Design a protein around this nucleic acid. Sequence first.
RNA 1: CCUACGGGCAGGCGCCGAGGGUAGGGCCCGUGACUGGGGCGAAGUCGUAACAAGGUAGCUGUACCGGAAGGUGCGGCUGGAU
RNA 2: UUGGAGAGUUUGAUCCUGGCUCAGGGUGAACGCUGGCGGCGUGCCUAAGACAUGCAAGUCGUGCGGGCCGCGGGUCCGUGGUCAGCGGCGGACGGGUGAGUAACGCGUGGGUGACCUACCCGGAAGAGGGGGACAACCCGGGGAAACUCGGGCUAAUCCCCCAUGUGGACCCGCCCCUUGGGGUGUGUCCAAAGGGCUUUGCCCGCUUCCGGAUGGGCCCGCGUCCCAUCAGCUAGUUGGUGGGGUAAUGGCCCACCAAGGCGACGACGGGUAGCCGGUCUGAGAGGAUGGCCGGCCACAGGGGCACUGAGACACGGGCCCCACUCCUACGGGAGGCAGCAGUUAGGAAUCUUCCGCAAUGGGCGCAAGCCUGACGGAGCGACGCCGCUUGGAGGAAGAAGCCCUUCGGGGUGUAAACUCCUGAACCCGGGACGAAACCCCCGACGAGGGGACUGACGGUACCGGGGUAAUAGCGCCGGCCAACUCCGUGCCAGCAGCCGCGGUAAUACGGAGGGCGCGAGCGUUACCCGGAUUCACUGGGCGUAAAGGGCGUGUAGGCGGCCUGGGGCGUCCCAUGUGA
Lengths: 82, 99, 61, 208, 96
Amino acid sequence: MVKIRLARFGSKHNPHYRIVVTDARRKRDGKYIEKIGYYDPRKTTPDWLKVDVERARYWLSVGAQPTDTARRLLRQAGVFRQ
Amino acid sequence: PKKVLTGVVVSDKMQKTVTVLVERQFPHPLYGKVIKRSKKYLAHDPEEKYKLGDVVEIIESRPISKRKRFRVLRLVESGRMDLVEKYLIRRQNYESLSK
Amino acid sequence: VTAYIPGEGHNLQEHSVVLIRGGRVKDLPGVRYHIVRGVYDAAGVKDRKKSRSKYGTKKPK
Amino acid sequence: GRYIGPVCRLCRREGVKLYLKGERCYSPKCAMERRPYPPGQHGQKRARRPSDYAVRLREKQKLRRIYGISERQFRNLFEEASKKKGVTGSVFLGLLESRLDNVVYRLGFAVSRRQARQLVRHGHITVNGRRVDLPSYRVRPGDEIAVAEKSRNLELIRQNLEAMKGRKVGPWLSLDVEGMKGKFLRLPDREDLALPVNEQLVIEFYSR
Amino acid sequence: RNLSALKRHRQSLKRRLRNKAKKSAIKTLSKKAIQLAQEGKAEEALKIMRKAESLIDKAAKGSTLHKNAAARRKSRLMRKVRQLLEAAGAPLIGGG
RNA sequence: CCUACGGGCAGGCGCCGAGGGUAGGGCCCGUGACUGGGGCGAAGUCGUAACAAGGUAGCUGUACCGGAAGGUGCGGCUGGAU
RNA sequence: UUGGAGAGUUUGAUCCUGGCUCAGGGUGAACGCUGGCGGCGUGCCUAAGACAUGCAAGUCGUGCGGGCCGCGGGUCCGUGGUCAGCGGCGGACGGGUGAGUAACGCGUGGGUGACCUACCCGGAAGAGGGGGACAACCCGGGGAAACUCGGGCUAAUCCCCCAUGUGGACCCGCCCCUUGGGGUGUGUCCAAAGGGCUUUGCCCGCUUCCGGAUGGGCCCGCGUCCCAUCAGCUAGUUGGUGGGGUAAUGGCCCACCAAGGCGACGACGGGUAGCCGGUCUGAGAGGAUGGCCGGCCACAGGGGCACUGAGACACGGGCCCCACUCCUACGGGAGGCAGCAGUUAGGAAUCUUCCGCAAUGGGCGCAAGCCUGACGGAGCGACGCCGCUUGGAGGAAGAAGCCCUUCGGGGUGUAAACUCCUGAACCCGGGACGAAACCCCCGACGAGGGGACUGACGGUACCGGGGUAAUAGCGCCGGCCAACUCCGUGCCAGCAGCCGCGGUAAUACGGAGGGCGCGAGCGUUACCCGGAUUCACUGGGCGUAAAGGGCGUGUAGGCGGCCUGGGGCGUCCCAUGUGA
Ligand code: SF4
Ligand SMILES: [Mg+2]
Ligand SMILES: [Mg+2]
Ligand SMILES: [Mg+2]
Ligand SMILES: [Mg+2]
Ligand SMILES: [Mg+2]
Ligand SMILES: [Mg+2]
Ligand SMILES: [Mg+2]
Ligand SMILES: [Mg+2]
Ligand SMILES: [Mg+2]
Ligand SMILES: [Mg+2]
Ligand SMILES: [Mg+2]
Ligand SMILES: [Mg+2]
Ligand SMILES: [Mg+2]
Ligand SMILES: [Mg+2]
Ligand SMILES: [Mg+2]
Ligand SMILES: [Mg+2]
Ligand SMILES: [Mg+2]
Ligand SMILES: [Mg+2]
Ligand SMILES: [Mg+2]
Ligand SMILES: [Mg+2]
Ligand SMILES: [Mg+2]
Ligand SMILES: [Mg+2]
Ligand SMILES: [Mg+2]
Ligand SMILES: [Mg+2]
Ligand SMILES: [Mg+2]
Ligand SMILES: [Mg+2]
Ligand SMILES: [Mg+2]
Ligand SMILES: [Mg+2]
Ligand SMILES: [Mg+2]
Ligand SMILES: [Mg+2]
Ligand SMILES: [Mg+2]
Ligand SMILES: [Mg+2]
Ligand SMILES: [Mg+2]
Ligand SMILES: [Mg+2]
Ligand SMILES: [Mg+2]
Ligand SMILES: [Mg+2]
Ligand SMILES: [Mg+2]
Ligand SMILES: [Mg+2]
Ligand SMILES: [Mg+2]
Ligand SMILES: [Mg+2]
Ligand SMILES: [Mg+2]
Ligand SMILES: [Mg+2]
Ligand SMILES: [Mg+2]
Ligand SMILES: [Mg+2]
Ligand SMILES: [Mg+2]
Ligand SMILES: [Mg+2]
Ligand SMILES: [Mg+2]
Ligand SMILES: [Mg+2]
Ligand SMILES: [Mg+2]
Ligand SMILES: [Mg+2]
Ligand SMILES: [Mg+2]
Ligand SMILES: [Mg+2]
Ligand SMILES: [Mg+2]
Ligand SMILES: [Mg+2]
Ligand SMILES: [Mg+2]
Ligand SMILES: [Mg+2]
Ligand SMILES: [Mg+2]
Ligand SMILES: [Mg+2]
Ligand SMILES: [Mg+2]
Ligand SMILES: [Mg+2]
Ligand SMILES: [Mg+2]
Ligand SMILES: [Mg+2]
Ligand SMILES: [Mg+2]
Ligand SMILES: [Mg+2]
Ligand SMILES: [Mg+2]
Ligand SMILES: [Mg+2]
Ligand SMILES: [Mg+2]
Ligand SMILES: [Mg+2]
Ligand SMILES: [Mg+2]
Ligand SMILES: [Mg+2]
Ligand SMILES: [Mg+2]
Ligand SMILES: [Mg+2]
Ligand SMILES: [Mg+2]
Ligand SMILES: [Mg+2]
Ligand SMILES: [Mg+2]
Ligand SMILES: [Mg+2]
Ligand SMILES: [Mg+2]
Ligand SMILES: [Mg+2]
Ligand SMILES: [Mg+2]
Ligand SMILES: [Mg+2]
Ligand SMILES: [Mg+2]
Ligand SMILES: [Mg+2]
Ligand SMILES: [Mg+2]
Ligand SMILES: [Mg+2]
Ligand SMILES: [Mg+2]
Ligand SMILES: [Mg+2]
Ligand SMILES: [Mg+2]
Ligand SMILES: [Mg+2]
Ligand SMILES: [Mg+2]
Ligand SMILES: [Mg+2]
Ligand SMILES: [Mg+2]
Ligand SMILES: [Mg+2]
Ligand SMILES: [Mg+2]
Ligand SMILES: [Mg+2]
Ligand SMILES: [Mg+2]
Ligand SMILES: [Mg+2]
Ligand SMILES: [Mg+2]
Ligand SMILES: [Mg+2]
Ligand SMILES: [Mg+2]
Ligand SMILES: [Mg+2]
Ligand SMILES: [Mg+2]
Ligand SMILES: [Mg+2]
Ligand SMILES: [Mg+2]
Ligand SMILES: [Mg+2]
Ligand SMILES: [Mg+2]
Ligand SMILES: [Mg+2]
Ligand SMILES: [Mg+2]
Ligand SMILES: [Mg+2]
Ligand SMILES: [Mg+2]
Ligand SMILES: [Mg+2]
Ligand SMILES: [Mg+2]
Ligand SMILES: [Mg+2]
Ligand SMILES: [Mg+2]
């Protein structure tokens, strides 16, 4: 399928994910279809998560499936509150 | 779009095919000047209706044969044998360039 | 090829294994490369004090 | 590491008194006051006309030796200036100044920059709260450059702070003395310090 | 020194067999049909032609023939049957 | 042999085919008794052709000659002193 | 308008020309002398030479039937596990390397009415009745092993037939369309698989079809290195008809027909090279370059081939030829590190046979969970950049030693000594972020709320407390170019990037003192750009410096007078898409 997940950027002991819609079989840090927000697990900032919720639902509509730990950072971003 | 080009038929000697000589100007990347380059296309003529002299349009088309990727769009103008002779002599002129 | 042996006095003989580097000797035509002292069977200059890295000579106490 | 060697000779070569020593610099025991001629066996000789190259070297070394800074870190700063907006000398001087260790000695907590580092280093300084033991820290407008509380009560800093009650220091700076805290209010206009150095010349040394 | 990559292979052998088999079958029948319609013999060619068309399409179902192939195999089949019969005529079945 | 029997599988023949072999060519690199000049050295031998009217103005294309630089013919150029 | 420096050297002297040379930046570097720390990078550029051992791709009992062991305990049935098998889906991703390739390979923009797409999503319909095989297992024969042949048994989501036909496929006709696009009428043809629980209902599954999305296949325009001392190339060649083949166009393949296609706008040939995003340099224009990261391509010991499949002509799948290698019981058989480590060879030279699935991501699975040398980290290497250290304040008209000395003194030098202040290291205690999902609860398995588990790195970072004055090296000092004196040597030994130094007063050799430049680094060699307006578009030239063709005639080509009009190709403007 086409998927929705965490493409690590940043650097050693400095994680910094981009949440991306990528082709399931792309490499993790690879060419993505579209960037839709980021995420910093170390939490060291005002906003360590923005999530284009309008987009994230498009992809969700049109088929995409998020990871486990990407579903949450979309729950946490209120993408499911109906 | 399907690329369309404009050129002269310089060879009718194939069956259901003609050679259309497209030209272009484009200024030279470094030296500035506008310069000319031309190219031959094997163009598809299902009705063997185009002739020498015929200045025509051809269109990027689904592949007909190895080397024919264009069908002749429309006649634009007949009788520019003055062109055919341009090319033709250049070709002829080559016999002298051997050793 | 043929290579210059820099420094005062050398322990080089036939069969001595040697490392070379670029750089001629203006005055010896044909010598266009230099032997690196202190590498393989070419030893450094015993007793240099000044500019030693260039003559492969270790530092004295 | 940094320069860490005979330090009087620097002035003696550079021809001017650079106040690298803190206290001694004002006594007539100061190297310069006793011998105002260059280091070594040949200082006493009738010096020859210095080449344009000579000229600009010394002038840079001067400006450098002043902050006792490594040629790299010096160069980078110059480069940081050459990129940056405005007039290069300003920004070079300006940037140079915003180095904590300097900013520590500026607000006087130390007698030498050379001593001010050791402080900055050994953790005895801080900025807007948190401790900062890196001398290269780029101090920026707004910063509160306290003394480490657990260093307020120290002989070496006691002495230094006290000779600072009524000292006027920098149109670009402030000092709640006695509380041992200061403020970086702005990067200097050139006016704001008159270090014995034509910094235009430094630009020119690098543009070679 | 091993795998169930072998397993995956063992199957290929057997699957292969099924394919090749069903595939030749087509050719025999399909062409037998083109044969008849040549010497047509109209009615029969159409009888056979169907038993082809079913097998062609029954391949189509699985991993044997691809869909468009069955389609391809079909188009060319019918055209041959018809145009052959059309040089004598006429059909005693369909289609069509 | 299966039957699923107007069929399938085995199996047989053919095309093409990795390559192998036979023959003959094209290019390129390496090398070779011997050989031709070339650069360099220089501390030698022979003369002194060119730079002065360079001691026969010089240079020249060509041809013939001579230990060597060179010479001479024929024509040309002045980039020749007087 | 954020951008532009030059110098040495042809002479007795000059100006000009012109080459050589240096200072600048750079690197996957390597060599020397020296070497304390930390972080982030980075590290076989050579033999796409050869490789021992291990490890790199599997998983599902919620598809099926069995074997061995065990927990329930009346041959049996349950439950668990475990071993293979049959059946799945994965294995075509991920990882590696740069051999080949001057090509639609790549880049850029486009075409596809000539196309495909597993798992995902949306939606329309649906799953009735039979029938059969093959392993595992049992039985025999072969071997040292690799294993294997024969015979009989049986389940299934394995196979096959009939039925149903929303639908879809195909021939013919017709309407819209206009390359094979969409609709339709007649004929014809094709579907299916069950499993589990809480068992009048869910859920994972299965089937035909439409659309989406996603990844592709194929096609065309423009760009893409050196040699013309490679000038002529071409028989599947170029076009056509018919077929075969494919997902699909196509001489991709075949038969026949025609005589065509290509080339100085450089065909053909030879040489070199994976291409771009970028990178280095440069005032810019340019030049150079493709390591790391990202995108595409190509290969998987050398070759050919196809099988299975949605997709491979498949690195750790198959067949066959070659080459090498091993194994052994001498009969026979086994291998493919350009995966991670690692060995060897080669080389100037490039690392641990580490740790873990905690994260992230991938495969299977309802889930639990299993696998994951992808990956997260750790290890080694000053390889690069960056940060930190070897202390700080005081301290003589100034010790000893050593250097010079006009013999009075000058120098190293506040340097040392010595004084006090701090406190890298080490000791001690505390000790993370990275981890909240999957799950369980309630809600409805949704929204939502609630609870819980889990850390390789790592007892590390860092917080706190106690605490020691604690590594310096290297180049250079004639001019360019910043830094000068003694001694020894005597055209020797040696130096040398260029000019040039040495023939007993050498700032140029060697040591010394002193000095300049950098500093856990400094220097060297190699290469790239720069200086080089020294291939000159920007931005050069040709009387004598290098350079006008011996002169005509002329093909192609480049260029072209005054006026008016059409077109609007160059050119110019705006919008818009693309420029990851
Ligand atoms: S004393 Fe005079 S010379 Fe010595 S350091 Fe202080 S100022 Fe410079
Ligand atoms: Mg055709
Ligand atoms: Mg020996
Ligand atoms: Mg050199
Ligand atoms: Mg030297
Ligand atoms: Mg000052
Ligand atoms: Mg000052
Ligand atoms: Mg000046
Ligand atoms: Mg500026
Ligand atoms: Mg399996
Ligand atoms: Mg048959
Ligand atoms: Mg198939
Ligand atoms: Mg199919
Ligand atoms: Mg057969
Ligand atoms: Mg053959
Ligand atoms: Mg052959
Ligand atoms: Mg053979
Ligand atoms: Mg010879
Ligand atoms: Mg010879
Ligand atoms: Mg003469
Ligand atoms: Mg004479
Ligand atoms: Mg004479
Ligand atoms: Mg003559
Ligand atoms: Mg004689
Ligand atoms: Mg004679
Ligand atoms: Mg004449
Ligand atoms: Mg400008
Ligand atoms: Mg310059
Ligand atoms: Mg000279
Ligand atoms: Mg001269
Ligand atoms: Mg001279
Ligand atoms: Mg010059
Ligand atoms: Mg510069
Ligand atoms: Mg350099
Ligand atoms: Mg080294
Ligand atoms: Mg060492
Ligand atoms: Mg390699
Ligand atoms: Mg080899
Ligand atoms: Mg070998
Ligand atoms: Mg394992
Ligand atoms: Mg299931
Ligand atoms: Mg299990
Ligand atoms: Mg199993
Ligand atoms: Mg594989
Ligand atoms: Mg792969
Ligand atoms: Mg890959
Ligand atoms: Mg390559
Ligand atoms: Mg080629
Ligand atoms: Mg192209
Ligand atoms: Mg393209
Ligand atoms: Mg059944
Ligand atoms: Mg049964
Ligand atoms: Mg049916
Ligand atoms: Mg055709
Ligand atoms: Mg295929
Ligand atoms: Mg062909
Ligand atoms: Mg043929
Ligand atoms: Mg062309
Ligand atoms: Mg050319
Ligand atoms: Mg090659
Ligand atoms: Mg290559
Ligand atoms: Mg330039
Ligand atoms: Mg240039
Ligand atoms: Mg390249
Ligand atoms: Mg490289
Ligand atoms: Mg790459
Ligand atoms: Mg190959
Ligand atoms: Mg190999
Ligand atoms: Mg092979
Ligand atoms: Mg192969
Ligand atoms: Mg499959
Ligand atoms: Mg293979
Ligand atoms: Mg492949
Ligand atoms: Mg392998
Ligand atoms: Mg073996
Ligand atoms: Mg045996
Ligand atoms: Mg065998
Ligand atoms: Mg092996
Ligand atoms: Mg190794
Ligand atoms: Mg080795
Ligand atoms: Mg070796
Ligand atoms: Mg590594
Ligand atoms: Mg995991
Ligand atoms: Mg996971
Ligand atoms: Mg799943
Ligand atoms: Mg495993
Ligand atoms: Mg492991
Ligand atoms: Mg790693
Ligand atoms: Mg005194
Ligand atoms: Mg003194
Ligand atoms: Mg003394
Ligand atoms: Mg004295
Ligand atoms: Mg001191
Ligand atoms: Mg945590
Ligand atoms: Mg130096
Ligand atoms: Mg310099
Ligand atoms: Mg000087
Ligand atoms: Mg001697
Ligand atoms: Mg002397
Ligand atoms: Mg020197
Ligand atoms: Mg000397
Ligand atoms: Mg450093
Ligand atoms: Mg270096
Ligand atoms: Mg250069
Ligand atoms: Mg020009
Ligand atoms: Mg010139
Ligand atoms: Mg003339
Ligand atoms: Mg003329
Ligand atoms: Mg003309
Ligand atoms: Mg014209
Ligand atoms: Mg005009
Ligand atoms: Mg006009
Ligand atoms: Mg226009
Ligand atoms: Mg644009």
